[PDB]
Amino acid sequence: TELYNTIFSETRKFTRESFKEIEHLTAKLANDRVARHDFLFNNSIALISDYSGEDSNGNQLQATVTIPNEITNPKEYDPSDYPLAEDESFFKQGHKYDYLVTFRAGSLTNTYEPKTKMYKLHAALDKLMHVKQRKSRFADLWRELCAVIASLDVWYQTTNYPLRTYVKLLFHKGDEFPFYESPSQDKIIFNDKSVASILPTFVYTCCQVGTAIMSGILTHVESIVAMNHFLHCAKDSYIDEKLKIKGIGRSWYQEALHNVGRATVPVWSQFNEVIGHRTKTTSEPHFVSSTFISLRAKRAELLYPEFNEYINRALRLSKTQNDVANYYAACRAMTNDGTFLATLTELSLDAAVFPRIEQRLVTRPAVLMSNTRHESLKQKYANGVGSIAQSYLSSFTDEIAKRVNGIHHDEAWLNFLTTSRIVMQAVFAREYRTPERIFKSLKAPIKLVERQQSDRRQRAISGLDNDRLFLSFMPYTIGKQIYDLNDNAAQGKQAGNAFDIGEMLYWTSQRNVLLSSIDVAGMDASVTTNTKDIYNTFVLDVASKCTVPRFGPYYAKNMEVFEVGKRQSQVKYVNAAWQACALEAANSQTSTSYESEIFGQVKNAEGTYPSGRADTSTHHTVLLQGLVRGNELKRASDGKNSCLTTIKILGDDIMEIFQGNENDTHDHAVSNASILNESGFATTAELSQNSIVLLQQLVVNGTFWGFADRISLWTREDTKDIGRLNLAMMELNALIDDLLFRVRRPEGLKMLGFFCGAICLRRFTLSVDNKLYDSTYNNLSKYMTLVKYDKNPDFDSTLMSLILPLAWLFMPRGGEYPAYPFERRDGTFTEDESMFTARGAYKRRLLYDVSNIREMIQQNSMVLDDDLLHEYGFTGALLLIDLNILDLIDEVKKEDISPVKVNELATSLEQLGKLGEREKSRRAASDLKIRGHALSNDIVYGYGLQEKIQKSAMATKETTVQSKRVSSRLHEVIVAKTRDYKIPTMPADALHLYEFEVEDVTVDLLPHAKHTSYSNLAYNMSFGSDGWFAFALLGGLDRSANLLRLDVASIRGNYHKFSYDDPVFKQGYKIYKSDATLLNDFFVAISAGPKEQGILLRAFAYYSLYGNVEYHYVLSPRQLFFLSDNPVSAERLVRIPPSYYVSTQCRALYNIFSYLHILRSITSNQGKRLGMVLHPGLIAYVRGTSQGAILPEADN
Amino acid sequence: FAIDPLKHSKLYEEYGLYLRPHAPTIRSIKYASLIHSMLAKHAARHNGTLINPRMYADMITLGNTKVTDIVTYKALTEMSTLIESFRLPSGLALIIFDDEKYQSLIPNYINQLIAYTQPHIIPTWQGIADFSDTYLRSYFKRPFELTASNLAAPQKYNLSPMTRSIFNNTGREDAVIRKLYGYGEYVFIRYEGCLITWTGIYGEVTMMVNLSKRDLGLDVGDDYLKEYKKLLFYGVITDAIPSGISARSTIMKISPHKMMNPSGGALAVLSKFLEAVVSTNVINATLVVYAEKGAGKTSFLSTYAEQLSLASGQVVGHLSSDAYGRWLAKNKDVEEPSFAYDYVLSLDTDDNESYYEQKASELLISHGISEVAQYELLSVRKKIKMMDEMNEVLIAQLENADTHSERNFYYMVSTGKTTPRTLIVEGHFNAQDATIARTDTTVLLRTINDTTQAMRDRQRGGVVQLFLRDTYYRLLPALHTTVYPFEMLESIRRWKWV
Ligand SMILES: C[n+]1cn([C@@H]2O[C@H](COP(=O)(O)OP(=O)(O)OP(=O)(O)OC[C@H]3O[C@@H](n4cnc5c(N)ncnc54)[C@H](O)[C@@H]3O)[C@@H](O)[C@H]2O)c2nc(N)[nH]c(=O)c21
């Protein structure tokens, strides 16, 4: 009856009884809220005050459950926590609290009459505590907590573990839940008004902590330490204390990895390969060791003393770099609860986007040429950081002007207006050829856009406009030309592999290397009006050499000009770009105005401009590369050595690598620090010998210390929590595959995602008409379990609940997820599917694997075993898929695979670029629609960006309850299917009929099994684990394949493997069969490169002959991070018997079979070689088809 | 032309270009007027847009194309018979003045043709388009300047009523000249401004004034201090700064001239301020005005506040540029000061000494500089070396938000109980942007002053005043919108109130 006593809990296998038992229990927890309350808050549970056990490296720790009085018995609402100014025009200047304060929930009451200042403030704070806390990804927050504690029960086989005592002592108030969320009102409804205001966030916090226990980062005692820390931080303001603690609680690993002494680490080459190991010393230099004193003194003052004792324990007990990594992952989970951080956007506006002056004032360049309004036309610096940056930036002007002269700018602005014709040309001639457009662009304001994110404050970023962007379209067009001339900016596409971090895996492997990393996200507030004048000199130097006739409303003309030494006005021929860039430089407003409910229009101090868009990310790129490379020129101009190798200005980071003598590297680092102090930034670079820091990544001596806290399984920012099961299951698979090398134990992730999908994603509501209701229930109740609701005579239709079979999570076209061992008829179990298994059509093999392929080969059967599948519910699951009741997913929503990128400079430059190509694809799509062969919008190239641009300019409610109407047509479809339903088998299922028998001969490992065995490349690939042994068998990765997929992805913006069920292919094949003269127009409309056009033209001719034959499988690049993408590496692992070479000519297909099987069965692979066993129907299906029709992507 | 000379003739009367009476260059302006009427009709027929504008551009500008369903080509054949009825040997070039006011009044059917045309651009020296051009010599009357030595009967020269127009630069009355010297049939050009050539320290300096010569009560040889307030309100120097205008410059020549048109971008930013002045949704409306130290800016802005108060009905506050320094020199030692607006304004007197002036004077004494001749004789490296030390005492106030910080001063003055709603705050340099208020609109000001001459000619402070001027110049680029005082007054006259 309880989950910890089940057969699945004790054996972790799916038998006939153990499947139905866990199915019934998760269907009980997923539906009834009496069951959830009694599951969480049961009376037969002993509480824990003192507990003892091992820490993350095995040493024994002692902790104590401590919930403070200030959360149990909360204070009353103090209205002086949110003070106002004396005019009450905005909040007070220095106010401590930007987030919620921990107070008693029933105390915030507004007695004030409407249309008052205090009434608007108390309505906004009521909105803060009831609306902003509703951020849950999948279901009810109590369901998301039940799934976590369910997976903890089933894993650890006990109820006696200390997180459940926190859950009971915090949320056990009465006989019902203390609060619930309501999807209709979009807010939390408090039941017990004597409760604290912060517990809806602590539900999400307990979910994240239980995720961290199942992930293997935290143990049960470290769970007590982490929850005590979070409960101590929740007085009086929780998120303020977290942001005050966060970095200081993490910076200790420098000293912890100093105190190790020596470490043995792998050595990477330039070409993504482990080429050896090396016993190095990790003892830091003296200028690094001088920061340890201030870090000790700041930690011992600020941190909670139990967490400080844990950090001082991690300092003194850590023996190896692997131990330091384990303790760092624990302390990173102890300081982050994964939730998104949300306020009233006028509480956080001040500390988000208010400008500041740092360390110095930046002066002006000397104006050498001016307008008749004395606006500067060209100008030059006398001495200082302006001269230093222009000593490097002025060596590019005469080359950039050639590339600016070649492009048509009126055409580029028409492309922008169209992608974000004659009608648009009339609009252009009406609006953009007049000096009134300049006046409108100076008159209109700038609206403020913010973006929530986890573990960081709300970031203000700039949005796309038509009027303010028209001023700065030309300095953007000039400043974006350095990306093709340097190495210094990283703007390219991200592969998502360990290919993507392979550069800093190389530099932390080399000898005599100093490493810098500047956290530069707060630069856009420190940038001042005189700081932008460094970039203005470069733009005006390019524009003075450029020659464009018209960028309307500007002409090239004889303009009166004042100069230096000339007492009167000269006359020169000043052109359109050097009028536009001069006007935009002379007229500057950086203030952003937000229109609040409390105060009306709230404006910012002039100075800081937010760093979202491309035109202001180019400014932040050009200025930083100019300063740091001009410093390298100035050191040679003064006679000192220059020991810098690379600079990669990432999205939020500047990364320098210095190689040389220790004195040389320290002096060049101190000089590059002092020049950024001079230019007006107070940024402290983190110098290290051996580790290098970014966001979401940490590379320590050729290893990868991934950050698992930055993936939130339980909260969202978009609040698109709808009952769309296909989108929700794809998002669940994406997040589980994203946590996969950041976890220390992926077997915990498989059980946690299993119970998330089984409880949170199980029920599904649909509304049936009244006359067909019981006849629909009697048809669908043979395969599923339904719940009927009350029949209301006042309306036309009634709802009824459809809870899925639990087998739906494991299905090919439905929800797809790695399975557990199912029991065959012979007592043998199917092999436990790993985290490395491929999705797509490869999930159809499970239906034959339960049906005993090893029996099907012996008896020469190919049909199925329908009775076991109807016993486990696979027939009901596949009928649910064939009815097509669930919600469909576009190709655009599929392209949001939700993969965190390494740099966001690429996402900044993504929106506004490639205008001519997106216009060409738009012209192709529209002029192909005119000719009769219309394409769907998800296939056309520019629509994925156009939809995201035009969506965020609407304020409409996207939250509407999802109901499926089963009318008479869908009813008669149900009646036609369910009366004679058995499982359909397409004839291309014969490729799934193959077997691997275990031979008695061990396999030689790769030579880098020895090199990666000392200190771990990731958290999951510790020595002897599944990731390490998969890397020792299949040594990734293929650099020549990843370069090819990035070259292909540099046209389409994204890479997809070819399939015959792709709607791109299906519409292309319709056009190919009907009118082949439009294939060129189609290939322009989809923006295919010349290799993809060859692939598509081979696939059309293969499909016309043979049909859909292909052996399809889907592997994510994030899922296979260090591992190989090429199935030729599995050739040496499986012996093919020599009677198959006589019959067939498909070797590379057999390699794909072996590759997919070894990735599937790495959990139980000990190292023996295998033996391929093929079905005679498989051989007869193969030898009636060429191999190129099966694998049209590959080149034989 | 881009704007029709026969329909909109009163626009062209203001540049001094008057129409010859109605010769193969006289029928052409009738032909162009017929083409403008036909283009206006065809544009208004189809939603304000021409349907095939490249053909119209060819047929009008080049004249090479003849066109012979109902929507599309009927209008083009109607245009082709009209142009073919002219029998011209070539086309008619499209003609555009360099004036921004002219470029912002061109019709939309001409803007649809400018993209496919190589237009002729006529330059304007002082705003008046030059008469030396072909198209303006042939189509409009040519002016004739009467001066004191040139004045005679029209028969002494070869002048006719049909050809020439008179420019009365004599200083005498037009009806007097027209009756006494036989100019009864000639048409006089009307110029409503003024053009003064002053002497200078460096040479000869011109000045354009938007007052009439009778309103501006100056004659030849008058001192600069006479009518200085009217010149400061309505004047613009058309020479490169630094110009030699000082308090002892005398007048060389006065002429009537075309009145200056205020810039549309400056008026856009000032109207953007007046929207927040009017609307009830904004609680505090704040303008930030930057200028060099010595432009005479409080004497203008203190009357700008009066005109804004009269035309608005509300009460307008005004902080000077030295308000925070004159506050801090008293209140730097006080543990809890007073931020009352009438206390700050009472400390805002001119006989109070600023904190920055005291620290700068101690710095100048620490280098042994006490005389304007000693400061003028320094090198550029020495001056920049001293200004880098004044920047260190300027960062100390802008660097944080303490109880005496500049951010806190302007915060507690802006967000007070008794303070006025609409404030006009003056500043010294661009680094105060973060520090002064929360205003969307901030401007930069230019007047008729050589600031390095005013801070050299004055005798009270001298070295400290000129040194703070040079420091504030070094910290103040021209990176916000340049506004003149007549543009700020014209903004209030143009905005519609209530
Ligand atoms: C109590 N409760 C309900 N749910 C969930 O809530 C769902 C339905 O919700 P409810 O039916 O239970 O709630 P209730 O009857 O109390 O709604 P109520 O009448 O109180 O709402 C009235 C509010 O609506 C406002 N209002 C609504 N419409 C209008 C309108 N036109 N005009 C003026 N005011 C309106 C009213 O001012 C008033 O505040 C159920 O499906 C149930 O799973 C819970 N879930 C958990 N996990 N724990 C719970 O305790 C719980």
Side-chain angles (χ1 to χ4, degrees), chain A residues 118-136:
Chain A
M118 296 299 290
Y119 181 75
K120 289 178 182 180
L121 186 141
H122 283 282
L125 292 179
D126 182 74
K127 183 179 179 182
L128 206 171
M129 73 181 292
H130 290 98
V131 174
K132 295 293 187 290
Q133 278 178 346
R134 186 180 182 270
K135 296 185 293 294
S136 67

PDB file of all heavy atoms in Angstrom, chain A residues 118-136:
ATOM      1  N   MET A 118      -1.253  54.103  -1.107  1.00  0.00           N
ATOM      2  CA  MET A 118      -1.018  52.942  -0.265  1.00  0.00           C
ATOM      3  C   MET A 118      -1.864  51.756  -0.693  1.00  0.00           C
ATOM      4  O   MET A 118      -1.432  50.614  -0.537  1.00  0.00           O
ATOM      5  CB  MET A 118      -1.288  53.292   1.194  1.00  0.00           C
ATOM      6  CG  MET A 118      -0.342  54.339   1.742  1.00  0.00           C
ATOM      7  SD  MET A 118       1.379  53.823   1.694  1.00  0.00           S
ATOM      8  CE  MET A 118       1.374  52.554   2.951  1.00  0.00           C
ATOM      9  N   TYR A 119      -3.039  52.008  -1.273  1.00  0.00           N
ATOM     10  CA  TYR A 119      -3.853  50.919  -1.802  1.00  0.00           C
ATOM     11  C   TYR A 119      -3.186  50.266  -3.000  1.00  0.00           C
ATOM     12  O   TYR A 119      -3.203  49.039  -3.133  1.00  0.00           O
ATOM     13  CB  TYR A 119      -5.235  51.425  -2.189  1.00  0.00           C
ATOM     14  CG  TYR A 119      -6.120  50.330  -2.725  1.00  0.00           C
ATOM     15  CD1 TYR A 119      -6.689  49.397  -1.870  1.00  0.00           C
ATOM     16  CD2 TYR A 119      -6.386  50.222  -4.085  1.00  0.00           C
ATOM     17  CE1 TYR A 119      -7.497  48.391  -2.351  1.00  0.00           C
ATOM     18  CE2 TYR A 119      -7.193  49.217  -4.573  1.00  0.00           C
ATOM     19  CZ  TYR A 119      -7.746  48.305  -3.702  1.00  0.00           C
ATOM     20  OH  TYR A 119      -8.550  47.305  -4.187  1.00  0.00           O
ATOM     21  N   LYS A 120      -2.594  51.072  -3.885  1.00  0.00           N
ATOM     22  CA  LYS A 120      -1.880  50.519  -5.030  1.00  0.00           C
ATOM     23  C   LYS A 120      -0.639  49.759  -4.587  1.00  0.00           C
ATOM     24  O   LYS A 120      -0.320  48.702  -5.145  1.00  0.00           O
ATOM     25  CB  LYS A 120      -1.507  51.631  -6.003  1.00  0.00           C
ATOM     26  CG  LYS A 120      -2.671  52.231  -6.765  1.00  0.00           C
ATOM     27  CD  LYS A 120      -2.207  53.352  -7.667  1.00  0.00           C
ATOM     28  CE  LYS A 120      -3.366  53.984  -8.396  1.00  0.00           C
ATOM     29  NZ  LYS A 120      -2.898  55.079  -9.282  1.00  0.00           N
ATOM     30  N   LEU A 121       0.041  50.251  -3.550  1.00  0.00           N
ATOM     31  CA  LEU A 121       1.225  49.556  -3.049  1.00  0.00           C
ATOM     32  C   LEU A 121       0.857  48.233  -2.386  1.00  0.00           C
ATOM     33  O   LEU A 121       1.526  47.217  -2.598  1.00  0.00           O
ATOM     34  CB  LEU A 121       1.999  50.457  -2.091  1.00  0.00           C
ATOM     35  CG  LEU A 121       3.348  49.968  -1.573  1.00  0.00           C
ATOM     36  CD1 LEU A 121       4.274  51.126  -1.530  1.00  0.00           C
ATOM     37  CD2 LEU A 121       3.226  49.437  -0.169  1.00  0.00           C
ATOM     38  N   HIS A 122      -0.206  48.221  -1.582  1.00  0.00           N
ATOM     39  CA  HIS A 122      -0.609  46.975  -0.945  1.00  0.00           C
ATOM     40  C   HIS A 122      -1.243  45.996  -1.922  1.00  0.00           C
ATOM     41  O   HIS A 122      -1.094  44.785  -1.735  1.00  0.00           O
ATOM     42  CB  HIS A 122      -1.542  47.259   0.229  1.00  0.00           C
ATOM     43  CG  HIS A 122      -0.831  47.761   1.449  1.00  0.00           C
ATOM     44  ND1 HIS A 122      -0.130  46.927   2.290  1.00  0.00           N
ATOM     45  CD2 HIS A 122      -0.704  49.006   1.965  1.00  0.00           C
ATOM     46  CE1 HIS A 122       0.392  47.636   3.275  1.00  0.00           C
ATOM     47  NE2 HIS A 122       0.062  48.901   3.098  1.00  0.00           N
ATOM     48  N   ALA A 123      -1.888  46.480  -2.986  1.00  0.00           N
ATOM     49  CA  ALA A 123      -2.329  45.578  -4.044  1.00  0.00           C
ATOM     50  C   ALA A 123      -1.148  44.975  -4.787  1.00  0.00           C
ATOM     51  O   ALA A 123      -1.177  43.789  -5.126  1.00  0.00           O
ATOM     52  CB  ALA A 123      -3.246  46.310  -5.017  1.00  0.00           C
ATOM     53  N   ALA A 124      -0.087  45.755  -5.012  1.00  0.00           N
ATOM     54  CA  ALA A 124       1.096  45.204  -5.662  1.00  0.00           C
ATOM     55  C   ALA A 124       1.837  44.220  -4.765  1.00  0.00           C
ATOM     56  O   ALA A 124       2.384  43.230  -5.253  1.00  0.00           O
ATOM     57  CB  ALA A 124       2.027  46.330  -6.096  1.00  0.00           C
ATOM     58  N   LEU A 125       1.856  44.449  -3.453  1.00  0.00           N
ATOM     59  CA  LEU A 125       2.532  43.499  -2.572  1.00  0.00           C
ATOM     60  C   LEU A 125       1.706  42.232  -2.377  1.00  0.00           C
ATOM     61  O   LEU A 125       2.262  41.134  -2.227  1.00  0.00           O
ATOM     62  CB  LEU A 125       2.852  44.148  -1.230  1.00  0.00           C
ATOM     63  CG  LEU A 125       3.898  45.254  -1.285  1.00  0.00           C
ATOM     64  CD1 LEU A 125       4.102  45.827   0.088  1.00  0.00           C
ATOM     65  CD2 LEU A 125       5.192  44.716  -1.835  1.00  0.00           C
ATOM     66  N   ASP A 126       0.376  42.359  -2.386  1.00  0.00           N
ATOM     67  CA  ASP A 126      -0.480  41.180  -2.418  1.00  0.00           C
ATOM     68  C   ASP A 126      -0.279  40.385  -3.697  1.00  0.00           C
ATOM     69  O   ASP A 126      -0.237  39.149  -3.659  1.00  0.00           O
ATOM     70  CB  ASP A 126      -1.941  41.593  -2.283  1.00  0.00           C
ATOM     71  CG  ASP A 126      -2.876  40.408  -2.268  1.00  0.00           C
ATOM     72  OD1 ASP A 126      -2.926  39.700  -1.242  1.00  0.00           O
ATOM     73  OD2 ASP A 126      -3.559  40.186  -3.287  1.00  0.00           O
ATOM     74  N   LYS A 127      -0.139  41.080  -4.827  1.00  0.00           N
ATOM     75  CA  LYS A 127       0.262  40.461  -6.080  1.00  0.00           C
ATOM     76  C   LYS A 127       1.622  39.786  -5.990  1.00  0.00           C
ATOM     77  O   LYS A 127       1.802  38.719  -6.582  1.00  0.00           O
ATOM     78  CB  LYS A 127       0.276  41.511  -7.191  1.00  0.00           C
ATOM     79  CG  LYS A 127       0.599  40.969  -8.562  1.00  0.00           C
ATOM     80  CD  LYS A 127       0.577  42.054  -9.619  1.00  0.00           C
ATOM     81  CE  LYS A 127       0.942  41.482 -10.980  1.00  0.00           C
ATOM     82  NZ  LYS A 127       0.967  42.526 -12.038  1.00  0.00           N
ATOM     83  N   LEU A 128       2.564  40.370  -5.241  1.00  0.00           N
ATOM     84  CA  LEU A 128       3.881  39.761  -5.069  1.00  0.00           C
ATOM     85  C   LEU A 128       3.765  38.440  -4.323  1.00  0.00           C
ATOM     86  O   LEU A 128       4.367  37.439  -4.719  1.00  0.00           O
ATOM     87  CB  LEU A 128       4.819  40.698  -4.300  1.00  0.00           C
ATOM     88  CG  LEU A 128       6.354  40.648  -4.454  1.00  0.00           C
ATOM     89  CD1 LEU A 128       6.988  41.830  -3.736  1.00  0.00           C
ATOM     90  CD2 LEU A 128       7.066  39.358  -4.086  1.00  0.00           C
ATOM     91  N   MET A 129       3.009  38.422  -3.228  1.00  0.00           N
ATOM     92  CA  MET A 129       3.036  37.220  -2.403  1.00  0.00           C
ATOM     93  C   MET A 129       2.024  36.171  -2.849  1.00  0.00           C
ATOM     94  O   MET A 129       2.096  35.031  -2.385  1.00  0.00           O
ATOM     95  CB  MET A 129       2.815  37.557  -0.931  1.00  0.00           C
ATOM     96  CG  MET A 129       1.409  37.950  -0.582  1.00  0.00           C
ATOM     97  SD  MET A 129       1.265  38.339   1.164  1.00  0.00           S
ATOM     98  CE  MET A 129       1.507  36.730   1.885  1.00  0.00           C
ATOM     99  N   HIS A 130       1.088  36.507  -3.741  1.00  0.00           N
ATOM    100  CA  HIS A 130       0.178  35.462  -4.204  1.00  0.00           C
ATOM    101  C   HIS A 130       0.376  35.094  -5.671  1.00  0.00           C
ATOM    102  O   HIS A 130      -0.057  34.016  -6.087  1.00  0.00           O
ATOM    103  CB  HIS A 130      -1.279  35.867  -3.974  1.00  0.00           C
ATOM    104  CG  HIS A 130      -1.682  35.886  -2.533  1.00  0.00           C
ATOM    105  ND1 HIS A 130      -1.714  37.040  -1.783  1.00  0.00           N
ATOM    106  CD2 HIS A 130      -2.037  34.885  -1.697  1.00  0.00           C
ATOM    107  CE1 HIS A 130      -2.095  36.752  -0.552  1.00  0.00           C
ATOM    108  NE2 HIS A 130      -2.291  35.450  -0.472  1.00  0.00           N
ATOM    109  N   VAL A 131       1.018  35.944  -6.468  1.00  0.00           N
ATOM    110  CA  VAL A 131       1.055  35.748  -7.912  1.00  0.00           C
ATOM    111  C   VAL A 131       2.458  35.356  -8.355  1.00  0.00           C
ATOM    112  O   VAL A 131       2.633  34.427  -9.151  1.00  0.00           O
ATOM    113  CB  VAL A 131       0.572  37.016  -8.642  1.00  0.00           C
ATOM    114  CG1 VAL A 131       0.732  36.888 -10.140  1.00  0.00           C
ATOM    115  CG2 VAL A 131      -0.876  37.284  -8.315  1.00  0.00           C
ATOM    116  N   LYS A 132       3.469  36.051  -7.830  1.00  0.00           N
ATOM    117  CA  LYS A 132       4.840  35.826  -8.277  1.00  0.00           C
ATOM    118  C   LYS A 132       5.409  34.512  -7.759  1.00  0.00           C
ATOM    119  O   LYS A 132       6.374  33.991  -8.327  1.00  0.00           O
ATOM    120  CB  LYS A 132       5.726  36.995  -7.853  1.00  0.00           C
ATOM    121  CG  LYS A 132       5.362  38.306  -8.516  1.00  0.00           C
ATOM    122  CD  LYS A 132       5.643  38.238 -10.007  1.00  0.00           C
ATOM    123  CE  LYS A 132       5.448  39.582 -10.683  1.00  0.00           C
ATOM    124  NZ  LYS A 132       4.016  39.970 -10.747  1.00  0.00           N
ATOM    125  N   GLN A 133       4.834  33.960  -6.692  1.00  0.00           N
ATOM    126  CA  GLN A 133       5.274  32.656  -6.210  1.00  0.00           C
ATOM    127  C   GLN A 133       4.709  31.492  -7.000  1.00  0.00           C
ATOM    128  O   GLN A 133       5.161  30.365  -6.785  1.00  0.00           O
ATOM    129  CB  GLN A 133       4.921  32.478  -4.735  1.00  0.00           C
ATOM    130  CG  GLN A 133       5.899  33.117  -3.775  1.00  0.00           C
ATOM    131  CD  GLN A 133       5.471  32.958  -2.335  1.00  0.00           C
ATOM    132  OE1 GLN A 133       4.330  32.608  -2.054  1.00  0.00           O
ATOM    133  NE2 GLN A 133       6.399  33.154  -1.418  1.00  0.00           N
ATOM    134  N   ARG A 134       3.758  31.707  -7.901  1.00  0.00           N
ATOM    135  CA  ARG A 134       3.186  30.606  -8.671  1.00  0.00           C
ATOM    136  C   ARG A 134       4.073  30.370  -9.887  1.00  0.00           C
ATOM    137  O   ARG A 134       3.839  30.928 -10.962  1.00  0.00           O
ATOM    138  CB  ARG A 134       1.749  30.909  -9.074  1.00  0.00           C
ATOM    139  CG  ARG A 134       1.066  29.737  -9.737  1.00  0.00           C
ATOM    140  CD  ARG A 134      -0.352  30.054 -10.119  1.00  0.00           C
ATOM    141  NE  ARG A 134      -0.993  28.886 -10.704  1.00  0.00           N
ATOM    142  CZ  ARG A 134      -0.975  28.605 -11.997  1.00  0.00           C
ATOM    143  NH1 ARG A 134      -0.356  29.418 -12.839  1.00  0.00           N
ATOM    144  NH2 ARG A 134      -1.581  27.516 -12.451  1.00  0.00           N
ATOM    145  N   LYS A 135       5.116  29.563  -9.715  1.00  0.00           N
ATOM    146  CA  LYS A 135       6.000  29.195 -10.816  1.00  0.00           C
ATOM    147  C   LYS A 135       6.320  27.715 -10.703  1.00  0.00           C
ATOM    148  O   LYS A 135       7.330  27.353 -10.097  1.00  0.00           O
ATOM    149  CB  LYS A 135       7.299  30.005 -10.799  1.00  0.00           C
ATOM    150  CG  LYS A 135       7.150  31.498 -11.021  1.00  0.00           C
ATOM    151  CD  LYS A 135       8.511  32.162 -11.093  1.00  0.00           C
ATOM    152  CE  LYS A 135       9.211  32.109  -9.751  1.00  0.00           C
ATOM    153  NZ  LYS A 135       8.510  32.915  -8.721  1.00  0.00           N
ATOM    154  N   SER A 136       5.492  26.866 -11.299  1.00  0.00           N
ATOM    155  CA  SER A 136       5.730  25.429 -11.250  1.00  0.00           C
ATOM    156  C   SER A 136       5.707  24.888 -12.668  1.00  0.00           C
ATOM    157  O   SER A 136       4.902  25.339 -13.485  1.00  0.00           O
ATOM    158  CB  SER A 136       4.683  24.719 -10.394  1.00  0.00           C
ATOM    159  OG  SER A 136       3.410  24.782 -11.006  1.00  0.00           O
TER     160      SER A 136
END
